[PDB]
Structures are given as C-alpha cells and as structure tokens.
Amino acid sequence: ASKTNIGVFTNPQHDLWISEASPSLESVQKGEELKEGEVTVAVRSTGICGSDVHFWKHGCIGPMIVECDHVLGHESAGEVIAVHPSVKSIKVGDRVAIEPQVICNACEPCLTGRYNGCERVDFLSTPPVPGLLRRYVNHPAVWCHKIGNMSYENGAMLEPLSVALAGLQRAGVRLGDPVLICGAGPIGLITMLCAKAAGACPLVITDIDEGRLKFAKEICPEVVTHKVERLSAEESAKKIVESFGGIEPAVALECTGVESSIAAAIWAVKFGGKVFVIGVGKNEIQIPFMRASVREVDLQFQYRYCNTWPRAIRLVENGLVDLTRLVTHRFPLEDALKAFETASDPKTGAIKVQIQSL
Amino acid sequence: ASKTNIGVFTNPQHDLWISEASPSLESVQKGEELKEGEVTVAVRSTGICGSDVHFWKHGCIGPMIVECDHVLGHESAGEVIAVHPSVKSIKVGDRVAIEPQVICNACEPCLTGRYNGCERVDFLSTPPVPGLLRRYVNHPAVWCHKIGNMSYENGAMLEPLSVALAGLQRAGVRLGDPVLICGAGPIGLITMLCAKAAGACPLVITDIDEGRLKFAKEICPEVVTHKVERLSAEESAKKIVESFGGIEPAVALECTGVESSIAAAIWAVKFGGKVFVIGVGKNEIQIPFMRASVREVDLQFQYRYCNTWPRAIRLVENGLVDLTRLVTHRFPLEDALKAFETASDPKTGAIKVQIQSL
Amino acid sequence: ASKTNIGVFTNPQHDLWISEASPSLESVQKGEELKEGEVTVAVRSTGICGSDVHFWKHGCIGPMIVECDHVLGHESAGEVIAVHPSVKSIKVGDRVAIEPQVICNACEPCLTGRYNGCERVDFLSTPPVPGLLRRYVNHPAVWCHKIGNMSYENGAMLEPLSVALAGLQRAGVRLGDPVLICGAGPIGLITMLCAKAAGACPLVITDIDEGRLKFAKEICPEVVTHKVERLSAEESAKKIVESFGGIEPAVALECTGVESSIAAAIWAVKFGGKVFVIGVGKNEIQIPFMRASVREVDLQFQYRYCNTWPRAIRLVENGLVDLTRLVTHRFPLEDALKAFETASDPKTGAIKVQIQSL
Amino acid sequence: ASKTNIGVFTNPQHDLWISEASPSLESVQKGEELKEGEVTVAVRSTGICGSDVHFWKHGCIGPMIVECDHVLGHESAGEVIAVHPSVKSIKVGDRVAIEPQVICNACEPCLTGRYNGCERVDFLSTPPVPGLLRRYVNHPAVWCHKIGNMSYENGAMLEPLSVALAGLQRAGVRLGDPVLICGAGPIGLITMLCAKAAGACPLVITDIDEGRLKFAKEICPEVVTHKVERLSAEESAKKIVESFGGIEPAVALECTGVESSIAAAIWAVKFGGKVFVIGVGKNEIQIPFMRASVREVDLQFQYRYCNTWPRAIRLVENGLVDLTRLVTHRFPLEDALKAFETASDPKTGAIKVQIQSL
Numbered sequence A, B, C, D: 001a002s003k004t005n006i007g008v009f010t011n012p013q014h015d016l017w018i019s020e021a022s023p024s025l026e027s028v029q030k031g032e033e034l035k036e037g038e039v040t041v042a043v044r045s046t047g048i049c050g051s052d053v054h055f056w057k058h059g060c061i062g063p064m065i066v067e068c069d070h071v072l073g074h075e076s077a078g079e080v081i082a083v084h085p086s087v088k089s090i091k092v093g094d095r096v097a098i099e100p101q102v103i104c105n106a107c108e109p110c111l112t113g114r115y116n117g118c119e120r121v122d123f124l125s126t127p128p129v130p131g132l133l134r135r136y137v138n139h140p141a142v143w144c145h146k147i148g149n150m151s152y153e154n155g156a157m158l159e160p161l162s163v164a165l166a167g168l169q170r171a172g173v174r175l176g177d178p179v180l181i182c183g184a185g186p187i188g189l190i191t192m193l194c195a196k197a198a199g200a201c202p203l204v205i206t207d208i209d210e211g212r213l214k215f216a217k218e219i220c221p222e223v224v225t226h227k228v229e230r231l232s233a234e235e236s237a238k239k240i241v242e243s244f245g246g247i248e249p250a251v252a253l254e255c256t257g258v259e260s261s262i263a264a265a266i267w268a269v270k271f272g273g274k275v276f277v278i279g280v281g282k283n284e285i286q287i288p289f290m291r292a293s294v295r296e297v298d299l300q301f302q303y304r305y306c307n308t309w310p311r312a313i314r315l316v317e318n319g320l321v322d323l324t325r326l327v328t329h330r331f332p333l334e335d336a337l338k339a340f341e342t343a344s345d346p347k348t349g350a351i352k353v354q355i356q357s358l
C-alpha cells in the first residue's frame, strides 16, 4: 500500500476518466474507515463487462441509472492488506476474489437464498454503489472469497464464471442435453465452456461476428458455430436446428439481450424448451408469443448470482474450465480508457479485457 | 341412439352453422367405423371455450388454422353407447368425460409425460381434427374417463378445470402463496376457484368487466377484485399490490392473453416471481424485458394439459371445487348459434355456456 | 417488567424444575446485556413440543444431548419490552412470535436459504442453547416476527404451524393430492389441517389412540381416520389404501418417528411416492429397503424450518388454519411440571399444552 | 437367420443352463408370431448384470421371484431381421439397442412419464418375462432404438449407461457438485464416468476391492479412490470426507445396495445432501435414522429407467462416455456358464462380461 487511490469513472454525459477515489491511502494505512467484519483489498485485476461499456456509453441498464460521477467494474480479485480486528475468515496477504454484492440478511430474497434479489442490496458496479475499478476497496470479509495461489486474472474471471453457473443452474442444463448459446462475447464463451464441461451435447453457438466464432471453435473444438444471417425468427431456428444435426435444443442460453436473437431461440428450442436470457437490452422487446405458447417454452431471466463462488472456484482448481484463456487484452489501471475503447470496439479482436494493478 | 348426427361447424369465412356429421347414426348402431380400443360416446354436454369463439370469429389461434368446414368444441362429457370388443376399461352405459386429445405414445413429449406436446397429436377441437360439438363421436377408451353418477355439466367442466390444474401445477402454486388472477372469464374464474381450494392467499382477480368481477366475488367471497383502468404496466401493478394488502404476488395466472395485462403482471409479481400465461392472443406482443430481467421473473405458457383428469375428478367428487355454479346458459345442440352469440357478447351476462344433447 | 425471571429446566438425571434465569430483571430494566440488533421479549405463551418431553424424559434426540441444567421450550410468542437503539424493525409494545433460531448468515446452508442447517446455529430449545420457557429472553429482532393483534396462543402456534409448512413444502403436497398423515399428536393434527387447507384429498390420518382420532375428525370433518392394529407393514398399507377409497397416497407425512409406522407408509404410498418423516425417534431403524427400491419411494426428513414465518402468519390471519382450537390445556409458568406431566400422559386428553406468562 | 434359437435359463434350484427357446427359427423365418408394431431382432451382444447373477444364485430380488425355467439378460443390442408390415420406425438390417421394457401406455406411471413404474410392465429380464439372452427375440419397434453404425458392445452398454443416467437425473447431479460413488462394479464405474462427464468434482469412488479401484483410476484418472475398511458409518464418512479434500459430497450414488455402505453415505453427504441408491440388496436394512433426520438427507431409490435412450446414444456418439472400455470378457452364447461364473467371481478381474451371437 503505497500509491494514491484512483478509480475509473463515468457520468451521465458518457465521459470516462480516471480520478482520485475512496478510501484514501492514508485511511487504509491506519485502518480508519474499516467497519465491522470489513477488510481492505488491493484490487489486482478487473475485467470489463458489457455492463460497464453500456453504463459508459448510455448511462443506464433498466431502472439502473448513472446520475453523477460513478466508479465502474465488478469482476475483480486482489490482495487483502488491512483487516478489521473482528475479521476471522480472512488474513492480510490473502488472495481473494470479490463478490460485488453486499447483502442485508433480513429481507425475503436473502433468507430464501435468492440473495441476488435483496431489497437493500449494494451491488458494487451499480449506481450509486462505486465499482471495483479502484486501487483499494473496503468490503465485508464474507464477500471476499479465499483463492489460495490462484492467478488474479482467474480470480477476476470468477465473476462472469459465476454468471454462467447461475444461468446454467436455473436453466436446468444437464449431461446429455443439447444446448444453444446465442452470442460469442465473453459471457457466451464462458457459458459455452460451462455447458461443455457440463456434458451438454451437441453444443451450438451463434454470433454476427465470424472472428468471435472462430475463437469459440478454437477454445471449444467440439462446438458447432453458427453465423447469423438476416432472417425471420422461424427461418433462423431452422438453420439452427440444422447446425444441431436435426435435434432441437433443450435449452437456449441467450447472451446478447437482442430481440431477433431471443425470438429465434424461442423458435429453436424443443417442446417444453427453456430460453434463458442472460443478456440485457431494451426496456421493451417484441416477443413471438404464440410460438412460446403452443410450445410451452419457458422464458427465464438472470439478475446476477448467488452461491456460485465456492463452485466457481472448484471448477477452476480442477481444470474443468479454462478462463484465463479468454483474456486477450491487459491494461494497467491508469490506461483504462484504452481498455474501454478496445472492449467496446469489436474490430479490436478483444474478448475479455482486464484492467490491472500489479 | 336414434337421432341423425349433426355437428357445429365454422369456416374460413367465419360462418357458424349446424350440419350433418360423422360418424353416421347407422354407422354407430352396427359399430362400423369402430377401431381398436375405441368407443362411441353420445355427447351429452359441451362447453364453449374462448378457443371456439376465436376460431369462429377469426379462423386461427397461432399455427392453428381453420382451412375449411370444421367442427368445434372440446369441453365434453357424455354416455357410452357402443364399445369395440377389445375395450376392457369402459362399458356401454357409462357416463364419461372426454379428454379431447389423442396421443401417439411414441414421441418424446409422450414418453416423458408432457403428452400435450405430442408430435402427432389429434386435438379434437383443433383443425383439422373435428370437435366434440356433435351428437356422437368415436374416441379411444383410454381418453374417456369414467365419472360414475357425476352430472354431465360437471363432467364437461372437467376440461377447463384441467386447464386450471395444469396451469397451477406448472406455475408452482402452494398453500400460503399470494396469487394474482388476470381475467374473470370462465378460465380465470375456475383458476381462482382452484387457487382458493389450494390455500392461496391473498387472492386477487382483475378484469375490465365489473359484472364478471361481482360474479367472482359471489362465488369466492374471500377474493379481492380489481377493476383495471387505463394505466402503464408499472402503475397498474402498484394498484394491484394495493389490492393485495402490500404483499407482492408470488404467481400471476394470466387468463386474458392480452398485452397490457401480461405487462402489469410482470410488474406486479415479487422478485423471482412467476407470470404464467394461460391466455392466448396476438402472434407477437411487446414485453417489458428489463423489469422481467432485473426481477428474475419467469414467463411461462400453457398448451392444454396432461394427467389432470383423475385429479380433476377427485376435486369435484370431494366438493373441493364447485364448477356447475359457473354455467349461466344452457342451449340444445340445434340452437348452437344462439349459444355462440351469447358466449361472445359479454353484455349477455354469460360465463360458461353449455350446448347439450339430452 | 416486574417479576423475577424464572425458567423451566431439565437435567441428565431427567428432573424437571423451575428456577431463576437470565437475563435478570434488573438487566432487562436498564437494557444491560442487550447486544446489536437485539430486543427483549416478555414471553407470553409457550407450547410444549414432543421435543421438550423427550429431552426431559430421555436427555437427548440424536447428537443433541442435555449435558447439565438446560431451559426448555421453543414454541413462543410474546411482548417486546426493551429494544437496542439500533433495532429499526420492531418497537416496545409489539406482539411478536419468536423464531427459536439464530443464524450466522455466512455458512453455505445460510446463504442458499436452507438456514435451518446453519453450521453455527443457536436453536433455542436445543442444548446448550436455553429455551423460551422463561419470563424474558434476549433475541435478535430479525427473528421476532410482528403479529399485530394476533392472540398469543396463536402466535405461539406459529412454530409448529411452521414445522407443518416446511414439511409440506419439501414434501411437495399439491391441490388434489391424496395425503396420508401418520400420528394425530399436535404435529400430525396441524399437518392434517395444513393438507386440508392445501386441497389435499382424500385425507387419511392414523394413530394408536382412538381419542386423538376422534379429535382429528371433529376439527377436520372431511378426513378419514384410521386406527392402527398390530400388522406387518404390507398388511397395514392395505388397510390404509382401503381408508383412501382404493387410491394410493402420493405423500405420507410421518409424524410419529416410529419404525412400524414409517414402514407401513413406505408400503402405502404410490409408485414414485414420497414418505416425509417429520417425527423423530431411535438412532437406527429397520427400513423395508426393497419395497422402497422397487417403488422409487423418496424417503425425506425434516430438521425444523426456514422462511415459514410470514406464510404461517398469512394462513392464520386469513382464517385458512385454525390453531388455537388445538390447545386443550393452559398452565401458568410456575405450574410447568403440571404442564409437562399432562403433556406426556396421553390419558390426560391433552393435545397442545401451553405454558403462559400473562 | 440360420441357427436354432437357444437361451440362457435359471431355475428356483439355482441352476444355469442353455436350452432351446422361443420364438423358433421357423417362426421367425416366415414371421409367424409377429404381432402389431413388433419386430424380430437377432441379439448380437448382451451384458451380464448383477441382476442376472443374483437371480441365478438366489432366485429373487424383492417381490421378483424366479418360479420356474426363466431366461435371463436385459442389456442387449442386435440386428433387425424381421419386421411386421405395420412397423414404420425400423427396417430389416438396422442395428438396434433393446430397451427391455414393454409399456401399457394407459396407467398413471405411464402417462406422467415415469413409465418404469407401469402397472402392467413386461420387463424382459424379470420373471415371468423371458430375458434377452437368446438368439432371437420378438419386441415392439418403439423399444428398439436405432444406433446406425455403433458397435454392438456399445449398443448393449446403452442399458446400464441408462441406469446411470436415470440415477443422475433423479439424484440431481450438476456441474461443480462433489459426488461420491459407492462401489466400483460395472454400475459404479459407469456412474463415475457419468458424473465426470457431467463436471462433477471432486469425484470419489469406494470399494472393498483394490483391483476394481485401480481399474476405476485408470479409466478416470481424475477420480480419487477410497478402499473401505471395517469402521462405523460415522468413522467411514470422515475417511470419505478426507478423500474429498475436506468438502462434503452433495450426492452419494450408491451402487452396492449394502447396509454399511449406505450408512456411511448418509453420514458422508452434506446438509440437505442426497443419498441415491441404485444398488439392490436385503428386503430390510438398518438405517441411521437420526443422522438422516438432523441432516435433511434425502434417501432416494431407482427402479430401472425411462427416456434415457436417445440421451445415452448422444453421449456415446459424441465420445462423452467410453463404455466399450469396461467390457473385460467376451463369451459366445453357448459358453454362457463360463460367462456367469466369471461374472460372479471377482478374482476373475472381470468388470463387464458380454455374451455374444456374432
């Protein structure tokens, strides 16, 4: 702990800039602002999510509005440097991965275990709560998960790994199931790696972008890729079922949040199929209602995660998923605008951009 | 068996008229067309569903198209009059309730028990398969369910009772759950009666029609009714949550198939809530995507039923549900156009119209 | 707050006696021992559970051992008299019902919502944690549930109501299901009332005790009672299926914890049936393994509850369950040995004995 | 079709011998006994299951009693040689894998999809229904699953593969779950291969037999093996949890049917753990009731399968599971007693013994 704490900010005007941030260095060196059960973590690595890019470029997601200077990022791991005297769970020096989510333990979504839906949740990347794109953060120990000697880029990947896992779990994917992934951005790709490790088969992944498809095929040889053309939902699903052999997918994990892609997924899945939407987009979309109806197709949606962390860790420690392999670009904190620019331009060839504090 | 077999037909031109129908009387008197495992049933009573009215008035549902002279109706009970020699299960003289659905027993939806999604299904009211608005029908015994001394109007109610039950089951309604019903037409009303017998509470039912709301309150005193005004989905859900006390529903059973009503339901239910759509409407609707997303709201849809019959029977025999109480109008077969006219004009005061063959 | 705090104690020697208890009066009058988020409740009413009787008479349940002077009782409601300054949720004067369970919010069973399995749980009636058979208790606010103007005997019934609900929920009981209840002690009876409100049918309840059967039939007219005779499991299940009509139960809610009763339940339920054991008994029992096997019968077990409280409250407020009707005996705190004696002798005619502090 | 039809028989006296069998050659050459929807299959390969060995050596399983000359075997694939004119699904020359199970399509377990529990089921290896250890069998087409150019030993493995899959599915195994397998006989081994392909981790398998453990480790390098010593259930579970790291298994797939092994599994699994018993043994076993109780441990049991076939096929075609690798011994039909002797003596080094008709 020697450097001044800076952070990566955006505003309603859609600027992105670095600036000084809390806690202050001095604060952390003497453990001033450190509350009950809290620690200070030196953030070593942080992935840029579609989340962040959308907040930067647009200022909102749904009810989530950037109303003033706001620090981004929520996919992070780092080193514990200060510890409140109460903190039993964790010690100075520990590599940890940060679950960007603080829970009240008292509302219904908390007590029934669906704690991503907590009624008083602080979700770190989400306005007004400051993100993790800073050099130091104060965070409750119970949300800093020990990772032993795991690399920091892996530890940071634990968060979108968790998005994939929570999706998978609520989607109900099982060994033998034919699974469709729509979108080969970071989340699609991790979700595909996940389906594959889960024994899904056959596996198909779609995208508008050939390059991201060739990447998907390199990191998961057994998948069948499908480049999407301008077609009605109905017609797109035929193509898709062709890519599967002639088998209709049991589950579509939708990772674009885009109208046409969700429609084709509704047309593509089997009778009693599940279309699970991880992606995020417009406030309102047009849905093919009657196709969903006559097919008993379940439409499901994800809002972050819960109870994925110990399991995400296990998958990485046992080599069941290979995450680090998805980070194409690495930028130091100070160069964050370079990071966001490349993370937003697909011509870049970027998949997962990491911002680091070594 | 003395009268000529007539039926109630519609066409792409949206006519509704009575006309001669198969099997012929003589055919049934000597058991000509009677295949393996089949019986002939003298249809005693048949309810008019929204289904039928929509086929008559519009010629389709989704992929379901009336392309020529087609016999309607699928909510029926009646008396067995002829029996193939193989038929073990059922005897001449038996009151039966007819499950309007013939299964291939060989496709995946059949073998996994989701047999409403059979790939070669004959669903009797559905083109091209002739409905049950006839005097006699030939039907496999395994789809004629014994009802002992139950009334025929009850026996006929067994089918929309079944729609309610299959909804309830897949929606996951349980004792103690707060449940919203949208629409107080026949299906809403049966679904409300069902939720109530299931210990749902509190119970709210919406409609645009005050009269159908006052009826709902008469047949289910403990329900809270809610008349819908022209409001944004968001604002409508606030009203709805007000009608609940301040509790947000766990499950919305949507029985109108209408866009605005489905939207408000998405806004109304709790975090991790389920909006279950029984209703049917437009090929495409606008959905509030981000509200669904941030709330982890499951959108589900129903396509008929399976394995509801023995259970629907139990509920009626034990007095747990009171169905006959919903039939407001009774018409003889010959007067079917009167029946459909009244079943389609809400000013009629009709709830469930039955067409009979005494 | 005027009286000295006494409590109801047992020991390894199987004595039961009243004695002074913590917190002390003075402690509560000035709010000494009151920690963060805690309140002091004046316990108004407390039911004696089979739990308590077994601890008194035997000194253990499974791994739960009375090793020294221990305060019993965990089915309680009462009045809030002192409040830590932090406590937001609750105010002095509030009637509350006490969930006898303190959670760490950090272990896996806690975060996934199965918080009855918390790895560091304080369960109040359970050694070494002091029960609720005292005049005052200090308890976290988040486990004191507001009950407005509900009676204290109802508020106290909320706990075994909760045992029934958690059973029901994990057993998977639904509207239309035929349900067997084994045992007509307090828990059986509440579970029966629950099944009934849940639209279970038909309902059968067994017991060795005719009097408790006649009581069951009085409070739930529609149930069929079954007196158990000395018979093989197989033969007992035939009798049981006879009591059902000829329908085999979908679910057996077993509330005796006794070997022969569990066996007959395994024989009684349908193919793919669930036998759910609420009852507690011997460390080891003999099971009919092959019957379970060839029938795909799920054996399930309950350990208390979670997330039943707001729902238990709703059922009582809406008149869906009538609990107070089960309390046959009422004793003041000081007369607790009379209470336990009568609660343990079935010749008493007791169902639910309450101990009160008016 | 040239050879006389012989079969492998056992009797109540526990003899095993080969003898002439139905249908007769001539019968098959002219398609005499061929009913509606039926085909004749020339059985090419058939695995010996624990089932068969137990029927041979003991004469029963539970209610399943060998009462006279009975043909064994139910794990088979072979070639279609005759086809009833109705048979659409399948053609002469097709390699098929035989699902040893004929369904009535009319009882409740059939229509709800749990069709392994059919009330009028013919299960081929099970008395009185003749097994598949014959040269020709007549079987309904809908239970002969096309396998294209798959090997016959794989096609035959499809049946115990199916036992594993149905277990897995009802046990609820998912990606990331720590899974315990008890027993390294054929079923354990396939179940382990299955868990592994399902992304289970860590994986532990137990056995009394070191050789079968070394085999397990060869075919699944990433598994941790555990040799069982004579210890209390409690103490055995500690050892087991040690083999896992210190993580407690989510699911125990029990494949021995033995009392002590099931007990340790009950002690071993986590809170809310599932112990799923595939194995079969004594009519009655002693259970550790209180451990199950305080842990909310679900005990589940399997009776064969349903809807595993298309999925078992997919797993083999995509190389997700490697079955053929488990067949250690291959015997021609005529040498069946050699086959059963070796399949019953573990000193043999046998895992899966196949009996063939080339």
Ligand SMILES: NC(=O)c1ccc[n+]([C@@H]2O[C@H](COP(=O)([O-])OP(=O)(O)OC[C@H]3O[C@@H](n4cnc5c(N)ncnc54)[C@H](O)[C@@H]3O)[C@@H](O)[C@H]2O)c1
Pocket (backbone or CB within 6 Å): A049, A050, A051, A160, A163, A182, A183, A184, A185, A186, A187, A188, A206, A207, A208, A209, A212, A228, A255, A256, A257, A258, A260, A261, A278, A279, A280, A281, A302, A303, A304, A305
């Ligand atoms: N719900 C959550 O909790 C959660 C968590 C993480 C990410 N997300 C969301 O998941 C989405 C994807 O995340 P990402 O980081 O991979 O973003 P990304 O932009 O890198 O990936 C989106 C991909 O979708 C592809 N795409 C666009 N239109 C398509 C179409 N019509 N068909 C097929 N593919 C199409 C793009 O080419 C791109 O590769 C984002 O909207 C993000 O906000 C949600």
Ligand SMILES: NC(=O)c1ccc[n+]([C@@H]2O[C@H](COP(=O)([O-])OP(=O)(O)OC[C@H]3O[C@@H](n4cnc5c(N)ncnc54)[C@H](O)[C@@H]3O)[C@@H](O)[C@H]2O)c1
Pocket (backbone or CB within 6 Å): B049, B050, B051, B160, B163, B182, B183, B184, B185, B186, B187, B188, B206, B207, B208, B209, B212, B228, B255, B256, B257, B258, B260, B261, B278, B279, B280, B281, B302, B303, B304, B305
């Ligand atoms: N999915 C299935 O298998 C299945 C089975 C039976 C019926 N249905 C469908 O269920 C729907 C209802 O059936 P029904 O027989 O009761 O028809 P119905 O017209 O009698 O009932 C529809 C009700 O919706 C009310 N309504 C219209 N707009 C509304 C709004 N904005 N908010 C609240 N209420 C509104 C109407 O006033 C009417 O009372 C139909 O569309 C029918 O086809 C589906």
Ligand SMILES: NC(=O)c1ccc[n+]([C@@H]2O[C@H](COP(=O)([O-])OP(=O)(O)OC[C@H]3O[C@@H](n4cnc5c(N)ncnc54)[C@H](O)[C@@H]3O)[C@@H](O)[C@H]2O)c1
Pocket (backbone or CB within 6 Å): C049, C050, C051, C160, C163, C182, C183, C184, C185, C186, C187, C188, C206, C207, C208, C209, C212, C228, C255, C256, C257, C258, C260, C261, C278, C279, C280, C281, C302, C303, C304, C305
């Ligand atoms: N698992 C939990 O979290 C939990 C919570 C509450 C109560 N319980 C347990 O539930 C059980 C019942 O509680 P209770 O308060 O009603 O006790 P209780 O003794 O009042 O009820 C037991 C009943 O079982 C009857 N019975 C005994 N043998 C029988 C047999 N062979 N067949 C049928 N009935 C038989 C008795 O006559 C008695 O009526 C107790 O063992 C108690 O510890 C468990």
Ligand SMILES: NC(=O)c1ccc[n+]([C@@H]2O[C@H](COP(=O)([O-])OP(=O)(O)OC[C@H]3O[C@@H](n4cnc5c(N)ncnc54)[C@H](O)[C@@H]3O)[C@@H](O)[C@H]2O)c1
Pocket (backbone or CB within 6 Å): D049, D050, D051, D160, D163, D182, D183, D184, D185, D186, D187, D188, D206, D207, D208, D209, D212, D228, D255, D256, D257, D258, D260, D261, D278, D279, D280, D281, D302, D303, D304, D305
């Ligand atoms: N339920 C079904 O539908 C179904 C289907 C197939 C097989 N099975 C049953 O599964 C069981 C296993 O089948 P299999 O063909 O592998 O038989 P098998 O005898 O080859 O395997 C049993 C294994 O259990 C091991 N074992 C014995 N005692 C043990 C203990 N105390 N701890 C750990 N391991 C122990 C043995 O060494 C042996 O390797 C049989 O009982 C069989 O009948 C059931």
Ligand SMILES: [Zn+2]
Pocket (backbone or CB within 6 Å): A049, A050, A051, A074, A075, A160
């Ligand atoms: Zn993200």
Ligand SMILES: [Zn+2]
Pocket (backbone or CB within 6 Å): A103, A104, A105, A106, A107, A108, A109, A110, A118, A119, A120, A121
């Ligand atoms: Zn909360």
Ligand SMILES: [Zn+2]
Pocket (backbone or CB within 6 Å): B049, B050, B051, B074, B075, B160
């Ligand atoms: Zn209808």
Ligand SMILES: [Zn+2]
Pocket (backbone or CB within 6 Å): B103, B104, B105, B106, B107, B108, B109, B110, B118, B119, B120, B121
């Ligand atoms: Zn079918």
Ligand SMILES: [Zn+2]
Pocket (backbone or CB within 6 Å): C049, C050, C051, C074, C075, C160
């Ligand atoms: Zn109790």
Ligand SMILES: [Zn+2]
Pocket (backbone or CB within 6 Å): C103, C104, C105, C106, C107, C108, C109, C110, C118, C119, C120, C121
């Ligand atoms: Zn805990």
Ligand SMILES: [Zn+2]
Pocket (backbone or CB within 6 Å): D049, D050, D051, D074, D075, D160
């Ligand atoms: Zn077998």
Ligand SMILES: [Zn+2]
Pocket (backbone or CB within 6 Å): D103, D104, D105, D106, D107, D108, D109, D110, D118, D119, D120, D121
């Ligand atoms: Zn059957």
